[PDB]
Design a binder for this molecule. Structure first.
Ligand code: YG5
Length: 191
């Protein structure tokens, strides 16, 4: 979680899509959803990103409807956005035992309990926090069994990105768990 405000310049695809959904939160605008193989993925927008500006206009106080509206009525050649990097998240670095564990329990993306004398504890992993990314990869919407496989298949060093569940649950409301799994960008970054 960089503590930085960054510029990104966008370019609509042939369908005139960027691949993005924005949710009004606390009078900000925040990335609800990032489509795979989308202009928005390529410039690196991520779930939980804050959109400070769209085309040099502040987003403070905009409805989700107005942000999506703004986005359609944009010219399409260049859409310059100002991004604050994933304000509502935090990233933990953990190591595995020889039993291959970081040492916690989660259910529906959300961590429910922490297992004592584990790296999860040594590093102060919290509960009631939804798993947002793992080692770069947005896992929002995957099944628990699939998340487990990614942690299984991770090296010894695992890097998790969490969000308070009350915030998490406010971002994802009005987005179907179908689309969460289908079209949300669950991919490693292109270089
Ligand atoms: C942000 N929202 C709700 C929309 O963009 C909905 N929408 N779709 C087509 C269309 C045409 C004129 C006005 C709103 C229109």
């Amino acid at each position: 979680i960089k503590q930085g405000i960054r510029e990104v310049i966008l370019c609509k695809d042939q369908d005139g899509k960027i691949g993005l959904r924005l949710k009004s939160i606390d009078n900000g605008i925040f990335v609800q959803l990032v489509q795979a193989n989308s202009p928005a993925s390529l410039v690196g927008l991520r779930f939980g990103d804050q959109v400070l500006q769209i085309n040099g206009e502040n987003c403070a106080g905009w409805s989700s409807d107005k942000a999506h509206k703004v986005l359609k009525q944009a010219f399409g050649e260049k859409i310059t956005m100002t991004i604050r990097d994933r304000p509502f998240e935090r990233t933990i670095t953990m190591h595995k035992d020889s039993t291959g564990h970081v040492g916690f329990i989660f259910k529906n993306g959300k961590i429910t309990s922490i297992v004592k004398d584990s790296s999860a504890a040594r590093n102060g992993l919290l509960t009631e926090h939804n798993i947002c990314e793992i080692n770069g990869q947005n896992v929002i919407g995957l099944k628990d069994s699939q998340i487990a496989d990614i942690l299984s298949t991770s090296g010894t060093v695992v890097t998790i990105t969490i969000m308070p569940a009350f915030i998490f649950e406010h971002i994802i409301k009005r987005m179907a768990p179908s689309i969460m799994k289908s079209l949300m960008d669950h991919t490693i970054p292109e270089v």
